Amino acid sequence: AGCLIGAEYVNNSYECDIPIGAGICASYQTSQSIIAY
Amino acid sequence: DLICAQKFKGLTVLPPLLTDEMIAQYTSALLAGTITSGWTFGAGAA
Amino acid sequence: ALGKLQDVVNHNAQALNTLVKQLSSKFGAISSVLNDIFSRLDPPEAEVQ
Amino acid sequence: TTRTQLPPAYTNSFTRGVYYPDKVFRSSVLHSTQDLFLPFFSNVTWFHVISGTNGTKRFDNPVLPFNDGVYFASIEKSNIIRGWIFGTTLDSKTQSLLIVNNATNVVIKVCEFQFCNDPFLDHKNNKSMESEFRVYSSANNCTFEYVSQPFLMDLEGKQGNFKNLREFVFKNIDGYFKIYSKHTPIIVREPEDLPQGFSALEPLVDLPIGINITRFQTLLALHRSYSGWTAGAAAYYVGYLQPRTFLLKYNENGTITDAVDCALDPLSETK
Amino acid sequence: CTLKSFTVEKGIYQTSNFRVQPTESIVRFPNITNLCPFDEVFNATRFASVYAWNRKRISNCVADYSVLYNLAPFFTFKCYGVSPTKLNDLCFTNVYADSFVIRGDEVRQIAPGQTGNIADYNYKLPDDFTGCVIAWNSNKLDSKVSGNYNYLYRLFRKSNLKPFERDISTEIYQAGNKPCNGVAGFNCYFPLRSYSFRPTYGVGHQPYRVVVLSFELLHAPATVCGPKKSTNLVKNKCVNFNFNGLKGTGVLTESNKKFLPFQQFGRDIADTTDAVRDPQTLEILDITPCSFGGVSVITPGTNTSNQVAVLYQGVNCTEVPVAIHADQLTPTWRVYSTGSNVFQTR
Amino acid sequence: GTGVLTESNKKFLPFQQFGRDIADTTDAVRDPQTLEILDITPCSFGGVSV
Amino acid sequence: VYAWNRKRISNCVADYSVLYNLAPFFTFKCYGVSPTKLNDLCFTNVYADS
Amino acid sequence: TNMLEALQQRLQFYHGQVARAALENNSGKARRFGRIVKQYEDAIKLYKAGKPVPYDELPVPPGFG
Amino acid sequence: STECSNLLLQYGSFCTQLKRALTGIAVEQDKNTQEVFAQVKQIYKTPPI
Amino acid sequence: IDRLITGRLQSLQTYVTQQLIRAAEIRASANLAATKMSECVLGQSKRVD
Ligand SMILES: *[C@@H]1O[C@H](CO)[C@@H](O[C@@H]2O[C@H](CO)[C@@H](O[C@@H]3O[C@H](CO)[C@@H](O)[C@H](O)[C@@H]3O)[C@H](O)[C@H]2NC(C)=O)[C@H](O)[C@H]1NC(C)=O
Ligand SMILES: *[C@@H]1O[C@H](CO)[C@@H](O[C@@H]2O[C@H](CO)[C@@H](O)[C@H](O)[C@H]2NC(C)=O)[C@H](O)[C@H]1NC(C)=O
Ligand SMILES: *[C@@H]1O[C@H](CO)[C@@H](O[C@@H]2O[C@H](CO)[C@@H](O)[C@H](O)[C@H]2NC(C)=O)[C@H](O)[C@H]1NC(C)=O
Ligand SMILES: *[C@@H]1O[C@H](CO)[C@@H](O[C@@H]2O[C@H](CO)[C@@H](O)[C@H](O)[C@H]2NC(C)=O)[C@H](O)[C@H]1NC(C)=O
Ligand SMILES: *[C@@H]1O[C@H](CO)[C@@H](O[C@@H]2O[C@H](CO)[C@@H](O)[C@H](O)[C@H]2NC(C)=O)[C@H](O)[C@H]1NC(C)=O
Ligand SMILES: *[C@@H]1O[C@H](CO)[C@@H](O)[C@H](O)[C@H]1NC(C)=O
Ligand SMILES: *[C@@H]1O[C@H](CO)[C@@H](O)[C@H](O)[C@H]1NC(C)=O
Ligand SMILES: *[C@@H]1O[C@H](CO)[C@@H](O)[C@H](O)[C@H]1NC(C)=O
Ligand SMILES: *[C@@H]1O[C@H](CO)[C@@H](O)[C@H](O)[C@H]1NC(C)=O
Ligand SMILES: *[C@@H]1O[C@H](CO)[C@@H](O)[C@H](O)[C@H]1NC(C)=O
């Protein structure tokens, strides 16, 4: 979708919370930070 | 050179949330459910 | 879980709010109040204004 | 005198420096305005005046450029801070502003004249007429005059434990000058920093003088040592002004309870 | 008429909208009556020079501009953003009169977005300038037979002046790179030159006395309102109001708004002055448009009968009945007062 | 105008001076002083979401 | 007026401040272009009919 | 540099002097400046027309640069 | 053209509802696929035979 | 320039309206497709044709 700044990408799979696009979604999870997956 | 001209006029395209691979995975899962389980998987555990 | 009904209500309220707030648009006019324009411009220009 | 230069300091502006952009009354609405404003959490100078070296004068009154506006504010206790003189070049030739606070009169003066090297006022009345006019020699060609009630209505400190927070925003556009003010006491002052609170500044006068202003100078009110000239402990803050877009939240009674910037951070822009 | 047919089928139809017509008109203006000293400005013995144009402060007075129209037979009164008669009609807060003398060739330079030596150097007008400019010949008044030199105009400066900025600079111009701190041969020059008005010149070179008025129409305090008689205020009635030029129709009622001393005009979510402050004895007032709504007909069909029923949409019957002589639109169109019982529905 | 000026491979004929695109707007321009062909493109803007 | 002269002017630099500073009496009504903007931007063909 | 540059420098300098006299609010000194300057424009129109410009006729110049 | 944007600012909030409508259309397009395809809670895999 | 801005804004509004109509049509088609998927893939439908 584009360049994402302020979130960390993890090699984990979860249900889509915040739809970013092209199969990437972000969420607020564990200290606490915004994670893209 | 056609998409670039539209983009230069502020006409962008948002990529779909579900990629083609995930849609293919959904179709494969539906095929597996309808082949190995019939209609039972559509109303509970396969 | 009643997202759809509240969503419809929000659409209606937002449409009404946008319609009423659109009166703030100058549209390129000298003012957004008809009375002020009629009180300061002559009819030859107030007509187009 | 042979005053030694002091290093400038900086302070977070926090959510301070907001004023009513117009006389129109709004209640229970979230209005967005585009005007000159002080950005939230901005560096502001921390000039502090005190009798250095236990009796040596401190000339911490530099010619701060005006640019587009200031956010002069203080935690002043008693009347020692006075004067907001302006000037393009600060000489006899250039027409300049003048705002004294003698007792209970602003005496707004717009005249061109020479300025003393270290202008200052005398807080104590002269015995037995007053030498408080030492800031300038004599006005030559006077264009505007204005006398009214003092810009501050704050009560004197009395026993103590409370100090005023006179905050002023000076704006000079389209040949006009505008003044906003608001005062409030402060409870604790151990960091000597602006409190993390919201305060709304209301207009009190508009000056129609169309004069070029590029530098800003402040004065002090000290009479005599109680060597040379000495004063008490005081500090004032200045914050520069740049165009901004602000979202103002009016309450039921019409006062700005809180406001949010539009370019401070992505969350602010989202709001 | 709405259906464009002489026969109407049974059903409900929306015909038009009813509005309570105003009962009367009230005008509220400040009660101060002293005339503004415009005659002093327009009748001064000698005007200030263009580079140091005088600025006059006008406040707390009533100004009648009709004297300018009636007298001074030769005048130029081209105005910006306001009609002349309506300028006499409407209100002002920050009125400022500036006076200077220039030749008749550069009278056009007093205009926003115009270039010229006086325009760039002596006097500059903002692009969004609101106000009139008044100019008239002054060959008789300001031209000695030998020559008039008192009027001075600026010709050289490093940078152009901002609008509504006055420069009285007399320092030596920096025409050349070398500094000289005094008038000399090669390039020192002087910023302002002098006029030499004489009666023998042509009309283009004749002196002209130009007076410009600065106007802003926000009119929150409206201290210099024009000549208008103030009528007694009417409360809780649909009456036309003229609060400091705020022409409109509505119901004025006492307000709970706590106006701050500087605040004069109230507003709402969408640019409607729902609250106003009385220019007379202080009174915070609310403005609400008087009762309106939709009008609907419940005819059971033309064939069946001509009897009809009228449904007023979203209005309480008590405060807007049919028997009131106020003639709430369509004076001849009125249902009988007690033809049938009035039913109040949701 | 405002944009990024770069070298262009679009062969301008001797009579040709300007250059447009499918979007009916100027895309290329020849330098009035030197016989050099340039294509003007706006500097990248995109969009931002939070 | 019936045999108005037509003069062709080209390949030159134009400065319109001459008409402004000099010729005190005139009538500079213009259509389709601002006077300062008349003096500012580039033209190609000018026709003088007197 | 011929003579036009010097003549226009003279014009500007005596216009500055005219401004000096006008601001000083003394009538006769400004009036004599007016006669001198009008004689200067007479000299200008004489010189531009092709006729030779007099030098001793006009008053002695100051220490111009 | 900064001045064109400045004069367009006088037109009021018209791009707000256009942007909202386009965003709603995009979300609707995403939800269409999400509803037509994601109808199974498990990703069944066919046996090797 | 106001005339040009009005024209461009009207063109954009017409495009948005066309997009909304097409989005409604596509949403109806997607609802039909989801119903068909549910009733034919996840089960056996007795509905004729
Ligand atoms: C600051 O104030 C002084 C004092 O008035 C100004 O000096 C005066 O300047 C004016 C114009 O340059 C002149 O005044 C004239 O003086 C004569 C007597 O010489 C008298 O008949 C009139 O009063 C007349 O106006 C003169 O040069 C000078 N006056 C005196 C008495 O020296 C000075 O100009 C002022 N500064 C500025 C920047 O205006
Ligand atoms: C107000 O006065 C200042 C001088 O203090 C002016 O600043 C000059 O501006 C010109 C052109 O913008 C520059 O060439 C000069 O170098 C500036 N002077 C200095 C000392 O920097 C300014 O233009 C005046 N007008 C305003 C600010 O509106
Ligand atoms: C502050 O200074 C001003 C100006 O110096 C004083 O204004 C005086 O007011 C009186 C009464 O209106 C006049 O008679 C004087 O001519 C004014 N000017 C003077 C005395 O220089 C003002 O009074 C001073 N403030 C106080 C509290 O005295
Ligand atoms: C707005 O004004 C009202 C009216 O004074 C305030 O209500 C008063 O609040 C104080 C303390 O906050 C109470 O002691 C009074 O009894 C209240 N009076 C009434 C009539 O309610 C109110 O606090 C103000 N602020 C807001 C946000 O409403
Ligand atoms: C300026 O002064 C003149 C006279 O000096 C004023 O003229 C008035 O109107 C007529 C003149 O035709 C006469 O009745 C008197 O000369 C004046 N009457 C009054 C009642 O003033 C003129 O009004 C003054 N003001 C201006 C021109 O603005
Ligand atoms: C995550 O996967 C990437 C492959 O793209 C790999 O380079 C990276 O080391 C992995 N990180 C972890 C913590 O497994
Ligand atoms: C404020 O000043 C301090 C002092 O050096 C500095 O560390 C800080 O980065 C400054 N902050 C800003 C926003 O300028
Ligand atoms: C005139 O208006 C003032 C406005 O403050 C008011 O105080 C005063 O009572 C009024 N007087 C009369 C006679 O209307
Ligand atoms: C009213 O309608 C009835 C039903 O058709 C019809 O018989 C009758 O003639 C109509 N009335 C008139 C006056 O024509
Ligand atoms: C109409 O007004 C009367 C008197 O004010 C009141 O008693 C009644 O409840 C009102 N009816 C409605 C429907 O508001």
Residue numbers in the entry:
A (entry chain A): 647 to 676, 689 to 695
B (entry chain C): 848 to 893
C (entry chain A): 944 to 992
D (entry chain A): 22 to 149, 151 to 248, 256 to 300
E (entry chain B): 301 to 646
F (entry chain A): 548 to 597
G (entry chain A): 350 to 399
H (entry chain F): 1 to 65
Please give me the paper's original passages concerning this structure.
Here we use a geometric deep-learning framework operating on protein surfaces that generates fingerprints to describe geometric and chemical features that are critical to drive protein–protein interactions. As a proof of principle, we computationally designed several de novo protein binders to engage four protein targets: SARS-CoV-2 spike, PD-1, PD-L1 and CTLA-4. Overall, our surface-centric approach captures the physical and chemical determinants of molecular recognition, enabling an approach for the de novo design of protein interactions and, more broadly, of artificial proteins with function.
Second, we screened a site-saturation mutagenesis (SSM) library, which resulted in the enrichment of three point mutants, one of which overlapped with a mutation from the first library. Adding these three mutations to DBR3_02 resulted in DBR3_03, which showed a KD of 80 nM and was folded and stable. A cryo-EM structure showed that the binding mode was nearly identical (1.4 Å backbone RMSD) between the DBR3_03–RBD(WT) complex and the DBR3_03–RBD(Omicron) complex. In virus-free assays, we observed that Fc–DBR3_03 had comparable potency to that of imdevimab (REGN10987), an antibody used clinically, for the wild-type (WT) spike and bound to the Omicron strain, whereas RGN87 did not. The design was sensitive to the L452R/Q mutation present in the Delta, Lambda and Kappa variants, but introducing a single point mutation (L24G) to relieve the clash between L452R and the binder led to the design binding to Delta.
